[PDB]
Design a protein around this ligand. Structure first.
Ligand SMILES: Nc1ncnc2c1ncn2[C@@H]1O[C@H](COP(=O)(O)OP(=O)(O)OP(=O)(O)O)[C@@H](O)[C@H]1O
Ligand SMILES: Nc1ncnc2c1ncn2[C@@H]1O[C@H](COP(=O)(O)OP(=O)(O)OP(=O)(O)O)[C@@H](O)[C@H]1O
Ligand SMILES: C/C1=C/C(=O)O[C@@H]2C[C@@H](CC[C@H](C)/C=C\C=C/CC1)O[C@@](O)([C@@H]1CSC(=O)N1)C2
Ligand SMILES: C/C1=C/C(=O)O[C@@H]2C[C@@H](CC[C@H](C)/C=C\C=C/CC1)O[C@@](O)([C@@H]1CSC(=O)N1)C2
Ligand SMILES: [Mg+2]
Ligand SMILES: [Mg+2]
Ligand SMILES: [Mg+2]
Ligand SMILES: [Mg+2]
Lengths: 361, 361
């Protein structure tokens, strides 16, 4: 009778119960199989030694359905320890998820896990809701994808969504590369996990990119120390802000794309004149890769440079924004008016999987 | 871009545009065909002379689909003069309408009249909404059927709906019968229309049934005069309140059913204890046959006799209650939140007619 909320990301699954303010289970979105029997999440991780690890979700889209069933089987029976036939399930999807994927998702829930009711919601919409608004533009930068999504009264505007395949995992690889400028090798998937850790702990977004580079090459006060697992210590300086600077200048990594400040602006510009002003004042950050200190001040300054000079620009960057999608679905799944909007097994029996596209809002 | 609202009753079609406070077209729900080429509504009526008249809706349910298409064709092209491919259409249905009927209704709208979007709503729910409430019990007595419908937050409670096949048309026939106690014959479908007219103009609900009969047989002050079309005049006395008294005592007409005060009570009693009190305080009358003067005071007194003696009983009987279903749909179709709940042609293409049962609320 409690609803389950499951948020499937490229990197992490966040799953739990509606009514909570945090996912009970967060675990790597991976399936592992013997190098020449399958393991999931945290499982797969303890034995990575003798497995090939596969990610079933790439850039926010489900591409391996057999593995995804195993992530879902693990989520219900091992992580949450519930019987799925007893619980309405809310699932999340990427903006612009293909219609065919969303139907396949519905079919699996109903025919393989026998849920009484499910729903599929766009991630960025749930994060807007978790901030208390129904109109806004969300910047959702996770592990695999970054999406700008303008939303008006609860409804995502498909023609103005921007997709940038440049996310947290790319920033980790770019940190690996530049650290092997001050002499370090990382290269293995294990050492990659170490650099991911450094990234999350030491990196930050510089208020002015150049001046910051001038500073780091004039005093040792930006260097920080970091202990590796083998005991050895490493020093990190200018790499701390150069790594995330990539989101503002993708040419750092050889991509020809606009940075996250320009896609935000361009997405606002694909909207009707009569709401632009509401979008400028309600930019919401969401996802793990928006956690860098300085990123929200940085965003404010860049978007004010591009927008008409009299526009009121406000960046909202809540402290819980790494889980905001999940918390959004926790709130939504608890509303009594949401209860009539679940897709029930009866509705699916009578109409089949394409029922899933009548969102009801 | 304006929505159409069409309310199909056993006797009258009420049709018009969302945003209005009254149906532009009210006309008899009849199809006429040459006694040995088809005519509708008011049409069929001017030539009844050489046609057989058929009612395609009986006791609120559509039973002749070919005729019903002609009522709908006439509604769009002759009465409202619009192109149906250009307008979302809201249709109404009886409580407990079979699933199969509602699908057939959807299929015709989409495949024969090519509407962009439609919706099918339960009549009694729209009348509740027109009174400004989302919780209440509606007594809807029309020409062909009477329905008691308890509704909690906008949703009709199917297991407590009561259906009584005793409505305005039966009261007309019973008035014909008792008038041929003071010497008058009516018998033909034309004279039936005359008695219907007398019914609507002269009849009323007595506050105490017996005392009223005692009164009419003690002074000529209750008789009223009525001019027939051929010039002759008729006198009506005790028949004025005996006719509608039938709704309270169906044995007047040989039926073994409970009266409208008992089905109301029984329907309230099939509900959960924790809302009964809200239903007792929000009884809404709706439909042509609730127009009799005195009926709402009458209802108050009868339901107070049956309910627990400390209950607060309130009867709401708005002046516009003969059109309240239509006005309900006029309001609903205008809400911006309703706009995402239309069934679109795309949704119907992908899922077919059984899409219609995902009500969204
Ligand atoms: N404090 C932090 N600073 C910078 N990055 C971080 C921080 N915390 C987590 N991240 C990064 O956020 C990413 C995980 O984020 P998230 O759970 O939002 O993504 P996801 O939903 O799995 O993937 P996606 O939305 O791309 O499909 C990882 O790359 C992780 O390193
Ligand atoms: N003032 C009135 N007093 C008594 N009865 C009336 C009055 N006005 C209309 N009626 C009756 O109301 C009936 C028409 O009501 P209405 O339009 O609500 O029914 P309907 O929707 O066609 O049919 P139903 O809901 O049974 O399918 C007719 O029987 C008509 O005689
Ligand atoms: C605390 C934590 C955060 C996280 O987000 O992990 C996701 C999950 C993960 C799966 C692969 C590795 C082997 C496995 C184990 C597990 C652990 C927990 C990881 O690979 C990412 O690391 C990629 C690689 S490098 C990067 O930047 N994203 C992001
Ligand atoms: C002003 C009006 C109200 C009405 O409700 O009519 C509906 C429609 C109607 C159809 C049959 C007759 C021949 C046709 C013509 C038309 C006219 C308009 C009628 O037959 C009813 O009369 C029945 C018969 S007797 C009664 O009580 N209900 C109710
Ligand atoms: Mg995500
Ligand atoms: Mg990879
Ligand atoms: Mg009616
Ligand atoms: Mg008849």
């Amino acid at each position: 009778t409690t609803a389950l909320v499951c948020d499937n990301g490229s990197g992490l699954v966040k799953a739990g119960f509606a009514g909570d303010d945090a996912p009970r289970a967060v675990f790597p979105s991976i399936v592992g199989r013997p190098r020449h029997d399958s393991y999931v999440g945290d499982e797969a991780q303890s034995k990575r030694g003798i497995l090939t690890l596969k990610y079933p979700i790439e850039h926010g889209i489900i591409t391996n359905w057999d593995d995804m069933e195993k992530i879902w089987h693990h989520t219900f029976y091992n992580e949450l320890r519930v019987a799925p036939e007893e619980h309405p399930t809310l699932l999340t999807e990427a903006p612009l998820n293909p219609k065919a994927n969303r139907e396949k998702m519905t079919q699996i829930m109903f025919e393989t896990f026998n849920v009484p009711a499910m729903y599929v919601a766009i991630q960025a919409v749930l994060s807007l809701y978790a901030s208390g608004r129904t109109t806004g533009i969300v910047l959702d930068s996770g592990d695999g994808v970054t999406h700008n999504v303008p939303i008006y009264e609860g409804y995502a505007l498909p023609h103005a969504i921007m997709r940038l395949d440049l996310a947290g995992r790319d920033l980790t690889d770019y940190l690996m590369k530049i650290l092997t400028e001050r002499g370090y090798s990382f290269v293995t998937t294990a050492e990659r996990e170490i650099v991911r850790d450094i990234k999350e702990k030491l990196c930050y977004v510089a208020l002015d990119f150049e001046n910051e580079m001038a500073t780091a090459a004039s005093s040792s006060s930006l260097e920080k120390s970091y202990e590796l697992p083998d005991g050895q210590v490493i020093t990190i300086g200018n790499e701390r802000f150069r790594c995330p600077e990539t989101l503002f200048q993708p040419s750092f990594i050889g991509m020809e794309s606009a940075g996250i400040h320009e896609t935000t602006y361009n997405s606002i510009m694909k909207c009707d004149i009569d709401i632009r002003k509401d979008l400028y004042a309600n930019n919401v950050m969401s996802g793990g890769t928006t956690m860098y200190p300085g990123i929200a001040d940085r965003m404010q300054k860049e978007i004010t440079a591009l927008a008409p000079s009299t526009m009121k620009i406000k960046i909202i960057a809540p402290p819980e924004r790494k889980y905001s999608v999940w918390i959004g679905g926790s709130i939504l799944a608890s509303l009594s008016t949401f209860q009539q909007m679940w897709i029930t097994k009866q509705e699916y029996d009578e109409a089949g999987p394409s029922i899933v596209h009548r969102k009801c809002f």
